[PDB]
Specification:
The structure is cut from a larger assembly and holds chains A (about 60 residues) and B (about 55 residues). With about 60 residues, chain A is mainly alpha-helical. In chain A, about 55% of the residues lie in helices and about 0% in strands. The longest helix of chain A has about 35 residues. Classes of the chains: A mainly alpha (about 60), B mainly alpha (about 55). Chain A: It comes from Bos taurus.
């Protein structure tokens, strides 16, 4: 292989690896914030569904 | 938390229907036909307000 092919092949390798490293660091930061704040799609632990509630008039009025 | 508002003792006075359950039982069918309008207005208030203090009138 000529030196230009290897040289520019190296740049393509470096770009991919560098981009993956940045994404890996963001994921650790995103995961830290989602877990601490619970304001994202991850670490979304279930709560009771409100469509299970009966809204019709009950046998007695105070409720 | 706040203080539970309550109507005064004289805001609750009224002439009570002092008859026994068998008297009401015997009159119930005509009573339901004759006093429907105020009765249903009161029951509408209770199920809407969900508060006995709000339907005293």
């Amino acid at each position: 292989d000529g030196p230009e092919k290897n040289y520019e092949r190296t740049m393509a390798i470096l770009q991919i690896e560098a981009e993956k490293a940045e994404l890996r660091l963001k994921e650790l930061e995103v995961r830290r914030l989602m877990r601490a704040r619970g304001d994202g799609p991850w670490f979304h632990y279930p709560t009771i569904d409100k469509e299970l509630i009966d809204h019709s008039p009950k046998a007695t009025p105070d409720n | 938390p706040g203080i539970v508002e309550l109507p005064s003792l004289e805001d609750l006075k009224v002439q009570e229907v002092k008859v026994s359950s068998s008297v009401l039982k015997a009159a119930a069918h005509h009573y339901g036909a004759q006093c429907d309008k105020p009765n249903k207005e009161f029951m509408l208030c209770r199920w809407e307000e969900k508060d006995p203090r709000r339907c005293l009138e």
